[PDB]
């Protein structure tokens with residue numbers, strides 16, 4: 001029993017965090033094999049980069065200074081070739097995630113990890129993280145068996161307190177650029193397939209007060225979802241919720257009628273899994289994984 | 297900016313998790329130096345759980361009855377002893393991944409990270425608090441026994457909890473790393489229930505200061521309160537009494553924001569009376585009590601927005 005916002009164990013990522021210094025700027029780097037990946041803003045980026053030499057970049061791994069032997073740029077990420085391969089390099093992949101998918105963040109400062117938390121890529125491509133000055137280069141990831149899938153690298157904070165960054169190939173998530181200019185997050189929406197997954201998790205943990213005898217059509221549900229700034233529910237989302245529907249005996253459109261009733265009426269002083277708001281940062285897979293016992 | 301329920305990086309603890317098997321039972325163990333610590337109920341059958349005599353069960357065991365697995369390697373047990381509700385298995389190999397550590401017993405209201413494990417393999421990390429009724433609201437399934445709670449301050453891991461059981465309401469009970477339970481619980485399948493739980497007042501106040509630091513002040517008012525009047529009101533909403541120690545502990549946050557503890561206590565009184573009115577505080581519609589005054593100072597900026 002119990003339902004917490006759970007992050008993946010961060011050990012395999014902690015062994016890759018390094019500190020990168022260029023002039024007066026200091027941020028975090030990801031050391032994988034003989035390459036250190038970090039935001040290019042540590043330094044017209046090609047014009048600034050051509051003026052730099054290898055020794056201008058100071059890389060620190062714990063108490064050891066790594067020697068930079070090369071440097072190149074890939075989109076908004078800087079790749080620093082170092083003399084030493086990381087002996088702690090885990091099995092890994094670089095993957096780009098979609099809005100609604102969740103991941104763990106290892107927040108770092110000066111190449112030292114300070115905390116781990118779980119979050120989701122919002123529909124407006126921002127993340128509601130917890131970052132202070134010096135956190136740039138902190139990374140987001142998932143684990144499949146023994147393989148670490150790196151999906152995010154932190155680059156900046158927007159005026160509303162939300163965060164923007166790139167995949168590990170340097171492509172930003174969202175219409176953002178790496179520079180101090182007028183940038184705002186677009187109007188955000190609720191991740192509908194995730195709220196439904198969390199309502200199934202509540203039923204599994206014995207919370208059924210919100211269930212009703214009714215069903216809805218997919219079109220009627222989406223007409224109500226569009227009114228409450230909820231992301232449209234697709235047939236793919238319904239198919240993905242299939243195993244949870246079979247486990248609890250509540251058809252996806254049956255659960256949509258419960259959510260429609262919660263959107264028009266609220267909770268009435270009641271809570272679901274200890275929350276007074278409808279929670280959208282748990283995917284259908286996170287619910288199955290936490291209510292099964294999958295290890296790494 | 298931002299405020300999340302953050303756990304400590306779990307790497308130093310992952311390198312200590314092992315699987316302990318005794319007969320048909322399998323649970324998690326903590327391998328530190330040449331000792332593996334695990335719940336003593338690993339020597340029980342489900343039948344023995346009603347009225348177990350642990351000393352009588354333990355004397356019938358020899359070293360080779362305990363199977364310890366660290367990854368793909370089998371550790372050899374060379375000794376065993378009991379300390380309260382924890383079993384200590386002496387192994388022939390010291391853990392090369394042993395971090396700098398201490399065993400600390402925490403008080404209710406204190407927070408810690410939990411590394412949930414099954415078969416000696418870590419599956420997730422989350423942050424939680426020791427409730428006033430000595431239980432934890434964790435997320436644990438069958439096989440999670442022996443999972444541990446900890447804090448990492450500087451580079452030293454402070455082990456404070458080891459998971460032992462789930463109560464009928466779905467909450468969890470366990471011990472410190474010396475085997476002393478938190479709460480009036482026993483490692484018996486006896487009809488025991490968690491006492492009525494209460495809200496950790498000093499933590500809610502800390503979180504209201506964190507909201508002011510991140511630029512939110514809609515809940516403040518022009519009133520103050522006496523400590524006694526605050527406690528007379530808060531106890532009616534099942535809030536833990538606020539002591540002078542709690543007020544002293546909130547001193548640095550009061551100096552940083554310019555809001556006296558008894559003025560913050562007056563906004564809390566009003567929040568309990570009126571509710572939120574469709575508003576949120578740090579993205580929450582409920583008053584959050586699982587962040588200590590120390591956690592707020594650690595996570596939030598030193599400069600108030």
Ligand SMILES: O=C(CN1C[C@@H](C(=O)Nc2cncc3ccccc23)c2cc(Cl)ccc2C1=O)NC1COC1
Nearest residue numbers: 001337436437438440441460461462463464483484485
């Ligand atoms: O009934 C039982 C079975 N069970 C075994 C074990 C125990 O509580 N294990 C577990 C730990 N953490 C989470 C769990 C989630 C689901 C199932 C077992 C869990 C135990 C240990 C001790 Cl020290 C005392 C009593 C018991 C005991 O009763 N417990 C719960 C109440 O609903 C299932």
Ligand SMILES: [Cl-]
Nearest residue numbers: 401402403406
């Ligand atoms: Cl304490």
